[PDB]
């Protein structure tokens, strides 16, 4: 499949490149037009410049349920093995695999061969999860996250067992174009639920920090609903998106990256407008 | 604010650092500006400039040829 996979990658990158070019043309026309309509002033740099909406990789989101594989870094800690066990229950149909002396590239080829849709890798620091990598395997995007405030079900006594049904999804706070891009990657990890499902999973954006919450609700009576929090609780902060798979750091391009040493980096946010 | 008719206008100071010679409630002489046009880096819609303060030209004060009387 070396020859076939190379051909499909080139045409995919070709179509992606054209979409970016036409959008950049729109922004230049839009920013130029609004400036003169204001009639306030003409920036000198503006003077110098003047003188398939659905993502291509996500063909098959609605037709078939996603298949998710979860693994860790080599020689996992005790608590990291518990966290990967909980993430398996969060995602319907997910599977968790032991990472032995497995090369990263060897994992990706096995996942592609068996039709695994998405691959999750989690890192830890002194027994607490600190990083998460989400990769869409058929040459899809790879997103890199850092975890901030992880609270596990194992820490909390006598919770019980979860509903494990297909949950409803809530996306809140994602307004910019990048935020729309990010929320798509998180949403497509989940299958199409049922209308009468009582399981709710929430992604809420606040100053480029994404909060993950898991809940089940019961309607005792009209207009009054009671929420009981279940499942792990953590925060996500994106810092990089790459076009290729996680076997391709050295060749894939960067769609978006966070730049913290910029003179105005402190006061700027990218997931909201 | 013009003394003759009480209107309030916006004028240009020729150079940054001539603002130091001008204080509030001072008396200045104002001439027209911008009939020819507005240069790059000039705010459109301002049609006046400051020429003298206390009957002394701003260039003479800037060049250190005269001192402002109080």
């Amino acid at each position: 499949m070396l020859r076939r996979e190379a051909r499909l990658r080139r045409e995919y990158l070709y179509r992606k490149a054209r979409e970016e070019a036409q959008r950049s043309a729109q922004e230049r026309k839009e920013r130029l037009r609004r400036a003169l309509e204001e009639n306030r002033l003409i920036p000198t740099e503006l003077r110098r410049e003047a003188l398939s909406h659905v993502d291509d990789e996500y063909r098959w989101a609605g037709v078939e349920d996603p298949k998710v594989m979860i693994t860790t870094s080599r020689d996992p800690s005790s608590r990291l093995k518990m966290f990967a066990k909980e993430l398996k229950l969060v995602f319907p149909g997910a599977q968790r695999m032991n990472r032995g002396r497995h090369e990263v590239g060897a994992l990706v080829r096995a996942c592609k061969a068996n039709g695994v849709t998405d691959l999750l890798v989690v890192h830890e620091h002194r027994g607490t999860p600190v990083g998460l990598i989400v990769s869409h395997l058929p040459f899809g995007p790879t997103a890199y996250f850092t975890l901030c405030n992880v609270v596990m079900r194992h820490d909390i006594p006598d919770l019980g067992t979860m509903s494990e049904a297909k949950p409803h999804l809530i996306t809140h706070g994602f307004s910019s174009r990048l935020g729309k891009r990010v929320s798509d990657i998180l949403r497509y990890l989940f299958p199409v639920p049922k209308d009468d499902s009582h399981r709710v999973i929430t992604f809420a954006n606040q100053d480029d920090y994404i909060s993950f919450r898991h809940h089940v609700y019961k309607k005792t009576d009209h207009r009054n609903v009671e929420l009981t929090e279940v499942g792990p609780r953590f925060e996500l902060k994106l810092y990089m998106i790459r076009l290729g798979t996680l076997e391709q750091e050295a060749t894939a391009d960067v769609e978006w990256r966070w730049h913290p040493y910029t003179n105005t980096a402190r006061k700027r946010v990218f997931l909201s407008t | 604010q013009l003394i003759k008719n009480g209107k309030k206008i916006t004028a240009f100071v020729p150079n940054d650092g001539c603002l130091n010679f001008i204080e509030e409630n001072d008396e200045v002489l104002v001439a027209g500006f911008g009939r020819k046009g507005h240069a790059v880096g000039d705010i459109p819609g301002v049609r006046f400039k400051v020429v003298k303060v206390a009957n002394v030209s701003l260039l003479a004060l800037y060049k250190g040829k005269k001192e402002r009387p109080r």
């Binding site: 003077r47 | 507005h38 790059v40």
Partner: peptide
């Protein structure tokens, strides 16, 4: 290099007025 720059300076002068600059930007739009 200096000759090339001086040719652009004449074009920069050829629209150096404020109304001239806004003139093309509507026209390019």
């Amino acid at each position: 290099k200096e000759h090339f720059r001086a040719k652009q300076k004449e074009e920069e002068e050829k629209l150096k007025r404020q109304k001239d600059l806004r003139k093309k930007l509507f026209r390019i739009q």
